[PDB]
Design a protein around this nucleic acid. Structure first.
Ligand SMILES: [Zn+2]
Ligand SMILES: [Zn+2]
Ligand SMILES: [Zn+2]
Lengths: 126, 97, 85, 187, 546, 98, 79, 490
DNA sequence: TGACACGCAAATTCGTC
DNA sequence: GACGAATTTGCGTGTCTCGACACG
RNA sequence: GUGUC
């Protein structure tokens, strides 16, 4: 097959969660479970993926809160890719902030670090 | 009009058919094969198989008569379906440094 | 009229061995001179070592990529006027 | 679940399955086709997001089926270099440690783990960590473990194609010990 | 572990075909085995293939006593492998002789540079580089360039006089140089003449003979002058650079074709084998390859090596054409053999003999008889022929109880099937050895079943001496137990039958897509007027008119 | 094969092919010359047009650029016969969709 | 967009459409008519054409490369 | 021109220049002249990179361009000028054997940048030489320019055609002026090394060396003197040296050599009365003048090269028959053995092995309008021109194979090489901080025996191949001078 | 045993040194 | 007056010269 | 090769 663009439209994990939640609830109602292994592969992939996502504490956030938190973090500098790299997991600890950005010692200060820390703790629930 | 559209009054022989038409294996399937094949190998040109004899030999449906058009299946289809909107990638938010 | 069943080797062993070379101080001087000419013209701006480089995602490590892009002045005056980059 | 990639391919619809919508059919046969398949360098496909534009169908004389060339975007799992993630360790080996993700069940960390790691498998699989600067720390890791946070680097792509006449891990990652899971990080 | 994505079945079409000639290097690169032995059969227990021989099983099997060697398979799924034979002395080619004598006229023989001017080379190149080029426009361009290359005898690049190039004998090239005219004495010819008397003090029988001593181009100088030609002037020489190259015109490495292309004949007469003429010619030319290598060490004179060389050269050129004219009587064989072009050229060839012919199955032919009790589009078929012919069809929801009754009827009765195919697994099963009561129930949707000829079938009926397009038609089949062909007399004029000794033939379409095409175009009701003038051809005959 | 003593078939020559051509039918002309006479599935390569085997080439020694097609056995036999005459039919494949 | 081709249905396209429909109906296809008890789907393929209930679009190609879409129901069937 | 030279220059421009530029360079050798857009189209490369490759090729005076039909610019790449990159070390060594490091470092940068101004040469030479010294970093600009003038008046570094419409027509004049410098802005004047002068000097060196190891050591001083007076008046094409007399020769002889008049004439007549026939005397009863023959000496040189090749490959007994048949032209097969006392069996073997490799020709003499291979006469003859031209085609493929073998071994032990070189910088910077012999045993045993034994063999192999390359490309130079002299541009 | 299209070649005339 | 160039014409050579079926 | 159209 032919590919137009190899790396394109970088998405998030909650988008995959939301896409896979409604994909299987309508598949079991419509599908006849006709092709055993062909459907089994998709079922296994989706089940393992949704399990890994549900173990990740990022499923309790609807898109409007995501948009609000992203617009709030857009303020200072941080990074286009490190934006969703920081949103992929919970930055509650100050050590994970130092590992998110490969160099977080000379760019900004730690007070602005705890600021965004509490900003994020006010966003995501537990 | 077949022997006048070239510009010269042709006759239907091996030499006239060698001049009016342009297919290697077609001209070889009429008269001397070795001469035409060796001339093609020496020159080394490419031949797009579109003649009835070529399509019969190789096995392509000839594009003369029934094979001139194409059929299309009419069913429920949508050219541009409504796609899922994004919640992450909108560049007026994603401003680079 | 005899027949061979085992094919000959792809490398038939030659008749004689090659000749040793001549060596003088000028010879190794020219050898080192060629070895430095190749390395220096490999490190010249005329040598295009930049076909094209692709980068998918942007990183923060933009400090260790300060490559100095100084082309030689093409001297368009003594050059075909049609070709203008 | 990292990058959605656009692709194009011709999909034939069975001549007997004409009652179902062509969009629904195409989506189902494109979900079944690329479900658990690894590709050359793009990564590992997960599922299908949506189709962008759908072309017309052609009926070739001789078969009687319906061929349609549609562009579809599928979700492929391909992370970048400096990305931290959590995993559940499967087991230990004298060469790295074998850990698995939810669906991706093959990643192994090399001997590059810490400042004083020691490996020895007498009967079971043991990873011990000594840490002495001015006090003494001894961390022990046995048969199974969970919640290991590490960076995925040294990504490798190997292709499997039939060599010769027709008469095994395509995706490979390693990890550096970042946050073993009390909690003790590593920097 | 995860599985890698792979394309299911690569289905593609053929866009266009390109013609090109290979080099000995590429020939060896493609070749598998190198034949060095001339012994065809080993003189051991039984008839068995000899390793590294012309009749080897490493190129492909031809019969059913031994499997394949490269890939374990049988004669059905086996295409073939090639081999390479190295020649001691490079030889001339039979089809590339005109190209060689033309290039020798174009390029030099002292400098290997095309004789043209710088201003004319570009005015030929820009005319050559055009977006539209037919095969005839390049036929005349070589003709136009050869003229200007043969007008001038002195090159502008260097200062040497070439002469001219003509052929002699059968495969022999003499470059006419060192001409002796009676106007002025040229220093080159003078030095040439002074260079010969230095050996005419031993034998005084060549001073009457040196006056026509000239340059005789042999394959060894010809191949090397094709290696010193620049690749810059090749696109102007009308030679595709990607397909061919000027050097690749001299054969020095012979390509052994696959073994499946030359089947062996077996006799129930003498426990006897009969090889192909190609195989015999190969075993005869390989014996010439070993007789020259023995004589150089054994010690031979120039002529005894030369006649063996040109014998090996002529046996390779007579292996393809095999009808060449102008052969010496001492070299001419008396028995006739067919070569590679003899398989192509001729009425019983492969171009219009096999490809055009392609004898059809599911057909028959029988004497016709009158029967004025049918319609205009009807024809009677005997039950004996209808029992042999079968028509495959897939079972729908409407054809379940219609074909279940037929498979219950049986193959011995006229309405019924003989072969049954399954939906997924594609294999045919007989209805005579197995039971019909149980396979009737064992039927699924989409099963191919081939039943006998029933009434209401689009069946083609025609005659052999076809001149016009109405000589073949399609009618509806009808089974009648009289063991003869019957049809209406009104449609006898299109076939031009005489009804005393005529035996017409009948064809049965196999696919459903063609059964509908022969009903609308080749219809008896549709085809009633003739395209020649427009008169109705089917009106009446003598008896009805009277 | 030829003859009734060996249970052969009938021959379809050029004069009867002209009658099918004058009508304009292409499906039946291809059905009773390629489908019912000799239907063969061959494979070639895209890099260099040559007859491979088992989805594998001996010229490039790589199965990456490998595809297949439907050809009558007569045409493949003619190609294998002409390749021994220093005449290599370099083929260029394409998708039927293309 | 204006059609520059004759509206009468050719027999060359009629035969190919009939063949395609006959081959598709034998592939366990949904019928577009309530057929009588009768086999040989070729015989009932003409019934759908006589009633103008065939979902097939004819694409006519011009020498330059222009494509023209026509409906079987829009074509005029004359016999 | 042929596939061998194109394959050689492809690698020569891939290892010297980049891949993108060498692609367009090789594409310019298959087609003589082509428009820019057609080139950028058929090559498949974008316009910007094609212009970069073109300006790179022009900056090194490797490709030319001309104005055609309407206003178009047709480019042309000459392969003969490209194949002269294997003699750069020899050129620099010949500049350094007469002059000193001044001329070497002046000319080594003129061939790496092609068209360059002298203000840049003096600049870079002064900078490099000031950086070479340690305490006294004083380099006079006048001494750098003195060697430049010595090159200019000996015709070693000439002026390329300067600037006098779609483009400008570059014109050349006979104004080889040296504008007076201003040492601490002169634009439009670029200098470039003259290669035919180097070829002439190499020809004189080869001639004097051959006549030295041939007969005498003293007569080579006399001929080198006779070749030193004609450097200014004689050119390359001219086959006959301008006439010179003995009285003028005795004027200019070396300072450390005291040879009188009549014995000098003795030496001159011994050089004239000689089978080699290098110098020829045209004189009178009173006196006369001598003329050196270059073509009939180059022919002997190429002949000696051919006999050396056949003697090293086939054997001395075989080269004996080669020389026997070269002397007696058009000899017959049974009469060659009564001369050469060699057994008939292996004699015929040697003859056929020579002829089957294109080392000899056979001419036909029939007595009938029919060829009649039985009733005809075969004669064995030798052709020098075709043999030299066919050995020249072999040398190029030999050099190409050597280059491919040298480039082949580097990419299997490459990561090993840049990994062992990465460890070198770990301790090279550490030794500056402080020498730790423990960090030395770290690198003493960190590299294993086969990890260090690979470079040992790779360096030797690369040296052997690069040393054989020069010994092979000197032979092509000795072989391309005999082919071009007989070639007469009509 | 008819068909003439290709080359190959010798007799002959206008032309300019 | 004598030599290089281009025209017209007698003479040399290669390819086939409808289809189908049955039997020995 | 023979026989029929
Ligand atoms: Zn095989
Ligand atoms: Zn020349
Ligand atoms: Zn291939």
């Amino acid at each position: 097959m032919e590919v137009k663009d190899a790396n394109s439209a970088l998405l998030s994990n909650y988008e995959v969660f939301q896409l896979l939640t409604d994909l299987k609830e309508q598949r079991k109602e419509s599908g006849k479970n006709k092709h055993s292994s062909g459907q089994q592969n998709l079922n296994t992939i989706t089940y393992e993926t949704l399990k890994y996502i549900s173990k990740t504490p990022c499923r309790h956030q609807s898109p409007e809160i995501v948009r609000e938190f992203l617009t709030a973090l857009k303020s200072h500098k941080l990074t286009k890719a490190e934006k969703l790299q920081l949103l992929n997991h919970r930055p509650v600890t100050a050590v994970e902030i130092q590992l998110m950005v490969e160099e977080s010692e000379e760019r900004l200060t730690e007070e602005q670090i705890e600021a965004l820390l509490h900003t994020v703790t006010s966003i995501l629930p537990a | 009009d077949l022997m006048t559209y070239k510009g010269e009054v042709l006759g239907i022989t091996r030499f006239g058919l060698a001049k009016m038409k342009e297919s290697v294996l077609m001209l070889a399937s009429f008269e001397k094969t070795a001469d035409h094949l060796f001339d093609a190998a020496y020159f080394g040109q490419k031949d797009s198989v579109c003649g009835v004899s070529e399509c019969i030999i190789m096995g392509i449906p000839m594009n003369i008569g029934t094979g001139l058009f194409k059929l299309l299946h009419k069913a429920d289809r949508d050219p541009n379906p409504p796609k899922r909107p994004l919640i992450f990638d909108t560049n007026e938010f994603h401003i680079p440094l | 009229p005899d027949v061979v069943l085992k094919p000959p080797p792809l490398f038939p062993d030659t008749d004689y061995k090659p000749v040793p070379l001549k060596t003088g101080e000028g010879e190794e001087y020219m050898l080192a001179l060629k070895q430095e000419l190749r390395e220096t013209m490999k490190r010249m701006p005329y040598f295009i070592e930049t076909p094209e480089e692709r980068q998918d995602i942007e990183r923060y490590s933009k400090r260790y990529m300060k490559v100095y892009k100084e082309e030689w002045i093409p001297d368009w005056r003594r050059l075909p006027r049609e070709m203008m980059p | 679940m990292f990058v959605l990639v656009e692709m194009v391919d011709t999909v034939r619809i069975p001549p007997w399955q004409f009652e179902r919508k062509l969009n629904d059919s195409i989506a189902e046969e494109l979900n079944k086709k690329l479900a658990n398949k690894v590709v050359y360098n793009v990564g590992l496909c997960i599922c299908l997001f949506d189709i962008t534009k759908l072309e017309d169908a052609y009926v070739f004389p001789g078969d009687g089926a319906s061929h349609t060339k549609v562009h579809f975007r599928c979700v492929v799992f391909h992370p970048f270099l400096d990305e931290i993630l959590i995993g559940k360790i499967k087991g230990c080996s004298p060469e790295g440690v074998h850990v698995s993700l939810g669906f991706f069940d093959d990643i192994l960390i090399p001997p590059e783990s810490l400042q004083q790691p020691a490996k020895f498998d007498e009967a079971e699989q043991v990873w011990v960590w000594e840490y002495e600067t001015e006090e003494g720390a001894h961390d022990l890791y046995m048969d199974t473990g969970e919640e290991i946070r590490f960076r995925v680097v040294d990504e490798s792509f190997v292709d499997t194609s039939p060599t010769g006449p027709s008469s095994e891990a395509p995706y490979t990652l390693v990890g550096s010990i970042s946050e073993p899971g009390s909690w003790w990080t590593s920097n | 572990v995860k599985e890698q994505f792979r394309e299911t079945d690569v289905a593609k079409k053929i866009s266009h075909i390109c013609f090109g000639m290979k080099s000995p290097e590429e020939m060896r690169q493609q070749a598998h085995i190198q034949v060095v032995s001339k012994n065809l059969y080993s003189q051991d227990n039984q008839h068995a293939p000899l390793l590294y021989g012309v009749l080897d099983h490493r190129m492909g099997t031809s019969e059913k006593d031994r499997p394949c060697e490269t890939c374990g398979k049988n004669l059905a799924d086996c295409l073939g492998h090639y081999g390479y034979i190295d020649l001691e002395l490079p030889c001339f080619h039979v089809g590339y002789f005109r190209a060689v004598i033309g290039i020798l006229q174009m390029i030099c023989k002292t400098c290997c540079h095309i004789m043209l001017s710088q201003e004319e080379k570009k005015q030929f190149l820009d005319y050559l580089k055009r977006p539209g080029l037919t095969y005839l426009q390049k036929r005349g361009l070589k003709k136009k360039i050869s003229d200007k290359c043969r007008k001038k005898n002195i090159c502008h690049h260097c200062g040497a006089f070439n002469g001219t190039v003509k052929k002699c004998g059968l495969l022999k090239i003499i470059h006419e140089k060192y001409k002796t005219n009676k106007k002025v004495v040229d220093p080159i010819v003078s030095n040439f003449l002074q260079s010969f008397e230095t050996a005419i003090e031993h034998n005084k029988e060549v001073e009457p003979l040196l006056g026509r001593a000239q340059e005789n181009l042999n394959p060894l100088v010809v191949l090397n002058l094709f290696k010193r030609i620049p690749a810059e002037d090749v696109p102007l020489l009308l030679m595709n650079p990607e397909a061919g190259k000027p050097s690749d015109l001299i054969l020095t490495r012979l390509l052994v074709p696959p073994l499946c292309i030359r089947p062996s004949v077996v006799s129930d007469l003498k426990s006897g084998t009969n090889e192909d003429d190609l195989t015999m010619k190969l075993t005869e030319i390989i014996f010439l390859n070993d007789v020259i290598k023995k004589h150089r060490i054994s010690g031979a004179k120039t002529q005894m090596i030369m006649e063996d060389w040109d014998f090996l050269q002529l046996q390779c050129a007579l292996y393809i054409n095999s009808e060449l004219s102008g052969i010496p009587l001492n070299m001419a064989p008396k028995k006739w053999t067919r070569g590679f072009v003899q398989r192509l050229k001729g009425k019983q060839g492969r171009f219009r003999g096999n490809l055009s012919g392609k004898r059809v199955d599911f057909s028959g032919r029988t004497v016709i008889s009158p029967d004025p009790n049918l319609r205009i589009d009807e024809v009677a078929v005997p039950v004996h022929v209808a029992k042999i012919l079968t028509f495959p069809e897939k079972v729908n929801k409407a054809n379940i109880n219609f074909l279940r009754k037929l498979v219950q009827n049986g193959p011995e009765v006229h309405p019924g099937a003989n072969f049954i195919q399954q939906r997924h697994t594609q294999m045919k099963r007989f209805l005579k050895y197995g039971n019909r009561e149980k396979m009737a129930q064992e039927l699924k949707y989409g099963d191919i079943v081939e039943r006998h000829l029933i009434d209401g079938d689009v069946v083609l009926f025609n005659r052999q001496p076809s001149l016009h397009k109405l000589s073949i038609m399609a009618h509806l089949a009808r089974v009648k137990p009289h063991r003869t062909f019957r049809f209406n007399e009104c449609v006898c004029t299109p076939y031009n039958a005489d009804f005393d000794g005529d035996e017409m033939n009948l064809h049965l379409p196999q696919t459903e897509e063609a059964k509908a095409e022969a009903l609308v175009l080749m219809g008896t009701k549709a085809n009633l007027v003739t395209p020649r003038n427009g008169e109705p051809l089917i009106a009446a005959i003598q008896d009805f008119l009277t | 094969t030829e003859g009734r003593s060996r249970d052969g078939g009938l021959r379809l020559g050029e004069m009867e092919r002209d009658c099918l051509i004058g009508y304009g039918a292409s499906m039946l002309l291809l059905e009773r010359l390629m489908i019912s006479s000799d239907a063969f599935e061959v494979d070639v390569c895209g890099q260099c047009g040559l007859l491979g085997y088992s989805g594998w080439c001996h010229y490039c020694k790589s199965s990456c650029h490998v595809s297949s097609l439907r050809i009558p056995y007569a045409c493949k036999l003619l190609f294998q016969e002409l390749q021994s005459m220093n005449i290599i039919p370099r083929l260029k494949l394409s998708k039927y969709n293309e | 967009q204006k059609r520059i081709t004759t509206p009468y249905m050719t027999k060359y396209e009629r035969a190919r459409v009939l063949g395609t429909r006959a081959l598709q109906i034998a592939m366990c296809a949904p019928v577009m008519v309530e057929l009588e008890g009768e086999t040989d789907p070729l015989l009932i393929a003409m019934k759908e054409l006589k009633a103008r209930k065939i979902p097939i679009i004819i694409r006519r190609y011009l020498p330059d490369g222009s494509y023209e879409d026509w409906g079987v129901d829009e074509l005029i069937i004359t016999d | 021109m042929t596939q061998a030279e194109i394959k050689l220059c492809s690698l020569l421009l891939q290892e010297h220049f980049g891949e993108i530029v060498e692609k367009i360079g090789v594409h310019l050798i298959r087609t003589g002249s082509q428009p820019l857009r057609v080139i950028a189209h058929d090559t498949g490369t974008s316009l910007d990179q094609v212009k970069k490759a073109l300006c790179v090729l022009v900056q090194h005076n490797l490709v030319s361009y001309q104005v055609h039909k309407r206003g178009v610019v047709e480019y042309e790449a000459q392969c003969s000028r490209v194949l002269r990159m294997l003699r750069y070390p020899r050129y620099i060594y010949t500049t350094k054997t007469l002059y000193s490091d001044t001329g070497e470092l002046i000319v080594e940068e003129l061939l790496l940048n092609g068209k360059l101004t002298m203000s840049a040469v003096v600049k870079k030479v002064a900078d490099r030489l000031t950086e070479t010294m340690e305490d006294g970093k004083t380099m006079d600009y006048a001494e750098v320019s003195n060697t430049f003038v010595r090159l200019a008046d000996t015709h070693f570094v000439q002026r390329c055609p300067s600037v006098p419409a779609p483009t400008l027509v570059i014109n050349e004049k006979d104004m080889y002026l040296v504008p007076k410098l201003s040492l601490i802005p002169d634009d439009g004047i670029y200098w470039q090394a003259n290669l035919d002068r180097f070829h002439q000097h190499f020809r004189d060196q080869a001639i004097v060396s051959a006549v030295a190891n041939r007969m005498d050591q003293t007569s080579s001083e006399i001929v080198r003197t006779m070749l030193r007076m004609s450097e200014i008046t004689t050119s390359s094409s001219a086959p006959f040296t301008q006439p010179l007399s003995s009285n003028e020769i005795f004027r200019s002889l070396p300072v450390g050599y005291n040879i009188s008049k009549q014995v000098l004439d003795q030496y001159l007549t011994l050089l004239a009365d000689d089978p080699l026939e290098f110098v020829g005397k045209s004189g009178d009863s009173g006196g006369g003048m001598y003329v050196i023959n270059l073509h009939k000496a180059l022919a002997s040189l190429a002949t000696a090269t051919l006999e050396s090749v056949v003697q090293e490959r086939f054997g001395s007994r075989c080269a004996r028959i080669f020389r026997l048949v070269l002397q007696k032209k058009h000899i017959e097969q049974k009469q060659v053995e009564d001369f050469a006392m060699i057994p008939a069996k292996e004699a015929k073997d040697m003859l056929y092995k020579m002829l089957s490799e294109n080392f000899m020709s056979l001419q036909e003499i029939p007595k009938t309008p029919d060829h009649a291979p039985s009733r005809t006469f075969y004669l064995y003859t030798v052709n020098i021109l075709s043999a030299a031209r066919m050995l020249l085609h072999r040398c190029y493929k030999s050099i190409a194979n050597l280059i491919e073998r040298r480039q082949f071994e580097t990419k299997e032990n490459k990561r090993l090489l840049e990994k062992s070189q990465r460890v070198e910088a770990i301790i090279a910077s550490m030794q500056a901080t402080g020498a730790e012999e423990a960090q030395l045993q770290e690198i003493e045993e960190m590299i294993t025996a086969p990890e260090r034994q690979q470079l040992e063999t790779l360096k030797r192999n690369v040296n052997k191949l690069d040393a054989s390359e020069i010994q092979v490309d000197e032979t092509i130079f000795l072989l391309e001078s005999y082919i071009e002299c007989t070639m007469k541009r009509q």
